[PDB]
Amino acid sequence: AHWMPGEPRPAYLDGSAPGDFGFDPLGLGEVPANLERYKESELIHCRWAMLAVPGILVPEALGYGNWVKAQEWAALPGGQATYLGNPVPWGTLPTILAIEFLAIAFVEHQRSMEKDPEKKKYPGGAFDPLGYSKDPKKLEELKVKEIKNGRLALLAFVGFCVQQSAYPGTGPLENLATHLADPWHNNIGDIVIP
Amino acid sequence: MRDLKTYLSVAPVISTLWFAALAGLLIEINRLFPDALIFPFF
Amino acid sequence: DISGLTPCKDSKQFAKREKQQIKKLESSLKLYAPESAPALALNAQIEKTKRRFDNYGKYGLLCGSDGLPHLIVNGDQRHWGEFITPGILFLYIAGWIGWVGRSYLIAISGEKKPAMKEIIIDVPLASRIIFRGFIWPVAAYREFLNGDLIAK
Amino acid sequence: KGEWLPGLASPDYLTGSLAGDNGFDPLGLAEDPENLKWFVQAELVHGRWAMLGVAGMLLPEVFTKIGIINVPEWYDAGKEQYFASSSTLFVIEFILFHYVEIRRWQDIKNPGSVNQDPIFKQYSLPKGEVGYPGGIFNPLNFAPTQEAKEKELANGRLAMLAFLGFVVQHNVTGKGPFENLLQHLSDPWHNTIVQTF
Ligand code: CLA
Ligand SMILES: CC(/C=C/C=C(C)/C=C/[C@@]12O[C@]1(C)C[C@@H](O)CC2(C)C)=C\C=C\C=C(C)\C=C\C=C(C)\C=C\[C@@]12O[C@]1(C)C[C@@H](O)CC2(C)C
């Protein structure tokens, strides 16, 4: 199950952790504390990207513009935000920024107060009302599925950002439409070589 | 003849023959190709 | 074109300098007899000057405001032969020399008194070693990968 | 085996065990065994490519000259227009060649490790020597004798020489290779390299 067949596995990575395939060319995981912190950061990044990607896909599928234009209203002085085509009455930069700062800071500081390394990655309890995590048999499978989907979401975000950089003011969906317009003409070729 | 070759193998004599040959090669190249500021072959 | 420069086949100061040099030579040419050897030498000098100016114009250089060519070491594709093409060549030759010398030193490290071989070079072994530097990049890369380039 | 120069002693590391060994190493590159193995694999693959390349750049010219097909020369193939842009074809080639060459490199580094099919686990390649995979790569199941290996190596060397000659003799004279041969056959004493340029 190694990432590259015929290549020896590292010592610290044996395959016990979910979604472990012995991939570490630069040897960044030698320090166990560093390995645990890296696991935490990777899980948080995966969860955020998983929550974010549909937030890009569902808009720009309706009449609303894209994930970039929805950000341009803050540049114009005295601008006001909109939601579902309706302008939010409380849409202005100072109040929005202050509310975001307060709420996010409180939530993150509450998160950081946990001490058990295992409880930080998988809190459990009140965070899962349905209760899929009671049975230990399916927990490993669910964890592996979550890790793989999170990595896929991270790759999706990288693709979104790079496609936006290549074509300013362009969404992923119109990019897919343009690619399907002529598969043998609109590819990565015209940008990789001028 | 052995010691003649040994003396001609000493450092100053070998150095002066080598430098004379190199200077002759450079001189002949500069005479064949008069002047050049860039490499136009490619 | 680049950095506010003028192509050398279009500038006027280039032609003015060429005319000045040609007139300076022709002023001295008049003194001697037309059939005499100094006349032939001065005619050869004039021909060389004209050929040099024509070659400089045809090679695609860029004169400046005052009229002299300017070299571009930037990395543009239109000036490959200005700095980059010669420079690589130099490195090759330079590497050759270094490689050869290093090899010779090792070839005399085995004996008990290498100083005698340093102050009195031997020609057979040196001639054997000299031509091994023609492929110096490959051998150097293989030695670097193997790890025998650095002492331990 | 044989000698590439009578009156010269062969180097010790070349013992004639390798296929196509004539003891030709005046500059002494293959002194270390690891370098010898790497250069053996290089001389295999480099040259297995060259034979196909030489055949591809030569045979169509002959066929066009005798008139069955009208095909552009090997130089003007790139200038011609195809069904798809050159960039997409280059990208496809880059990805596929990346995959196959990484597989081959992994095999060379760790022999007998990438024989198993990643998709269909049941299929596999029979064990053999590095550089001669055999198995599915040998549908007709020919005999991999030493004589066949020597023939292949000699043909590869001839292909190297042919490709270098093709490229340089087109560089000096813009005319194609087969037309160059025909011009030389028109009058050998006035159409050699020395007589013209
Ligand atoms: C024989 C080959 C040889 C080689 C491979 C090196 C290698 C090196 N030199 Mg040394 N060096 C040499 C001879 C050599 N040196 C000689 C003869 C002298 C006395 C003039 C020096 C004095 C010297 C100084 C003062 C410095 C170096 C430094 C360096 C290092 C950086 C490169 C550079 O700056 O070059 C510098 C090169 C020179 C100033 C001149 C070298 C040109 C000589 C004449 C060519 C070798 C020819 C030789 C006679 C060939 C005989 C072989 C033949 C019999 C087959 C590099 C490790 C630099 C450093 O320390 O880097 C860390 C530095 O500070 N070298
Ligand atoms: C692979 C190769 C050529 C491959 C060509 C290909 C694929 C061509 C493909 C195409 O044509 C087609 C099909 C169709 C066209 O439309 C497009 C192109 C793309 C043009 C050449 C190698 C060519 C390789 C060459 C010439 C190598 C020569 C090496 C020599 C002589 C080494 C000598 C020594 O190393 C020894 C042996 C021992 C040492 O001790 C001493 C020294 C002297 C160092």
From Swiss-Prot, chain A:
Residues that, per the record, bind chlorophyll b 1: 3
Free-text description of this protein's post-translational modifications in UniProt: Photoregulated by reversible phosphorylation of its threonine residues.
GO cellular component: chloroplast; chloroplast envelope; chloroplast thylakoid; chloroplast thylakoid membrane; photosystem I; plastoglobule; thylakoid
Positions that bind chlorophyll a 3: 84, 146
Transmembrane segments: 48-68, 87-107, 152-172
Positions annotated to bind chlorophyll a 1: 23, 42, 151
Keywords: Chlorophyll, Chloroplast, Chromophore, Magnesium, Membrane, Metal-binding, Phosphoprotein, Photosynthesis, Photosystem I, Plastid, Thylakoid, Transit peptide, Transmembrane, Transmembrane helix
Binding-site list for chlorophyll b 2: 47, 88
Binding site for chlorophyll b 3: 108
Residues involved in chlorophyll b 4 binding: 111
Protein family per UniProt: Belongs to the light-harvesting chlorophyll a/b-binding (LHC) protein family.
Subunit structure comment from the entry: The LHC complex consists of chlorophyll a-b binding proteins. Red-emitting heterodimer with LHCA4. Interacts with LHCA5.
Protein name (record): Chlorophyll a-b binding protein 6, chloroplastic
Origin species: Arabidopsis thaliana (Mouse-ear cress)
Stretch of the intact protein here: 46 to 239 of 241
From Swiss-Prot, chain C:
Any GO CC annotation of this UniProt entry: nucleus
Molecular function per GO: mRNA binding; protein domain specific binding
Topology versus the membrane: Single-pass membrane protein
Sorted UniProt keywords: Chloroplast, Membrane, Photosynthesis, Photosystem I, Plastid, Thylakoid, Transit peptide, Transmembrane, Transmembrane helix
Transferase recorded as keyword: no
Localization: Plastid, Chloroplast thylakoid membrane
TM helices/strands, residue ranges: 80-100
Biological process annotations from GO: photosynthesis
Primary location: plastid
Top-level taxon in the UniProt lineage: Eukaryota
Family listed: Belongs to the PsaF family.
Role: Participates in efficiency of electron transfer from plastocyanin to P700 (or cytochrome c553 in algae and cyanobacteria). This plastocyanin-docking protein contributes to the specific association of plastocyanin to PSI.
Note: Plants lacking PSAF have altered thylakoid structure and are not viable.
Protein name as annotated: Photosystem I reaction center subunit III, chloroplastic
Organism this protein belongs to: Arabidopsis thaliana
Originating gene: PSAF
From Swiss-Prot, chain D:
One term of GO molecular function: protein domain specific binding
Residues that, per the record, bind chlorophyll b 2: 48, 91
Ligand binding (chlorophyll b 1): 4
Topological relation to the membrane, as annotated: Multi-pass membrane protein
Cofactor comment text: Binds at least 14 chlorophylls (8 Chl-a and 6 Chl-b) and carotenoids such as lutein and neoxanthin.
Binding residues annotated for chlorophyll a 3, in chain numbering: 152
Function field: The light-harvesting complex (LHC) functions as a light receptor, it captures and delivers excitation energy to photosystems with which it is closely associated.
Family affiliation: Belongs to the light-harvesting chlorophyll a/b-binding (LHC) protein family.
Protein name per its UniProtKB record: Chlorophyll a-b binding protein 4, chloroplastic
Gene name linked to the record: LHCA4
Full-length numbering of the shown residues: 54 to 250 of 251
